[PDB]
Amino acid sequence: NNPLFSPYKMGKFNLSHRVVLAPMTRCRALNNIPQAALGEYYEQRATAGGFLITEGTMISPTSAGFPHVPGIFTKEQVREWKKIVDVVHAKGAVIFCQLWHVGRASHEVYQPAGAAPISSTEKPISNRWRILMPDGTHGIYPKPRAIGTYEISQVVEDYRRSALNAIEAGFDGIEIHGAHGYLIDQFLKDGINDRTDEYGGSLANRCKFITQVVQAVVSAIGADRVGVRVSPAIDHLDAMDSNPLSLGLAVVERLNKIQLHSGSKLAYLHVTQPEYARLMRTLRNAYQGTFICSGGYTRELGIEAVAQGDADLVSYGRLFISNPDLVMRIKLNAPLNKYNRKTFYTQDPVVGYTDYPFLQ
Ligand SMILES: Cc1cc2nc3c(=O)[nH]c(=O)nc-3n(C[C@H](O)[C@H](O)[C@H](O)COP(=O)(O)O)c2cc1C
């Protein structure tokens, strides 16, 4: 009947349905340590056979540009994440940790010793955009420091080590955040990447960083535990490309080759809808594997996406904020409850986080 409740084999993982929790930063992980509130939040949304992706999670002390986002680069963070993974696995769900480096989308207040954020480029995000500060005001993005290739290789090692830490905490896998104008996208997009070395210029060079990140995590934990998220067609944080479809296809070609070289498929490719329908289907058709679509989906649009072959899985963000039982509501076609944008990024462990009710 409802194709969202057709089972799906996501490689090693047997899913009972196709409704996915999209990664969402919520800023409840005080001092970058996962908290009991995150356990309650993910437990509420977990279902038997359902797939969850965490909020973006720091891979290193320089990787953050939001307040109170979790990390997975210290043993303390690993120990606390395990408690969260455990309550999600108790409900029979599958959960991946999203690994997130913001690059130049940061601020002195978020950096050790107030050092400059790192990027592909020395140019700041323009003041068309503002950063959320810890006090809830909006600040100015600073000038970043363009990193050399040794430092690039050390960032890759931060992804690799974080992927191993995620597996130690019990996560089923990880997702590489290569979207939305953050560090990887600062190398992908020719509206940002002004390098004249082997990581800039040509499509091949701009794709080197994501390829190396993905290959490192695949070697460390196995391709079937790795997902990759990208967003070729956007303007967020000035992340425009002159040819988004060609950039997306170049990325897809690199993922297909990583799979051929490794003898195994990635867990999935995850693409968010252009934000400033053909592009989505074109990347899906080009990719040898599982495709998760995201961005503006509703019950009806997700049913259509799976029914028409546009995606294998559909991820939902904002509707999962305010509907902890979103999966059940979609199954029953029960009315969905609104979300309160004001409390997307506040620190309260309950209000606007775990106090959205279930169906009566
Ligand atoms: C509050 C909030 C936080 C988000 N944080 C992340 C994040 O940490 N990583 C990421 O890749 N996307 C993040 N997103 C984007 C969502 O994963 C998702 O693509 C978007 O919400 C999908 O559209 P929808 O809300 O209409 O379902 C966030 C979105 C929202 C609204």
Author numbering: 9 to 284, 302 to 385
Quote the authors verbatim:
Jasmonates are phytohormones that are pivotal in mediating plant responses to various biotic and abiotic stresses and regulating plant growth. The first crystal structure of OPR3 from tomato (SlOPR3) showed that the enzyme crystallized as a self-inhibitory dimer in which the L6 loop, a critical loop involved in substrate recognition and coenzyme binding, from each protomer intrudes into the active site cavity of the other protomer. Based on these observations, it was postulated that the formation of the self-inhibitory homodimer represents a mechanism for regulating OPR3 activity and, thereby, jasmonic acid biosynthesis.
The crystal structure of R283E is almost identical to that of the wild type (RMSCα = 0.22 Å), except for the R283E substitution and L6, which lacks 16 amino acids (V285–E301) due to disorder. As R283E initially failed to form a homodimer in crystallo, we assumed that the amino acid exchange disrupted dimer-forming and -stabilizing interactions. However, our DLS results showed that at higher concentrations, the monomer–dimer equilibrium is clearly shifted toward the dimer. R283E showed the strongest tendency toward the monomeric state among the variants, as even at a concentration of 5 mg/ml, it exhibited mainly the monomeric state. Structurally, it is unclear why R283E prefers to crystallize in its monomeric form while R283D prefers the dimeric form. Considering both the DLS and crystallographic data, it seems that the amino acid substitution R283E increases the flexibility of loop L6 in the corresponding variant, impeding proper dimer formation.
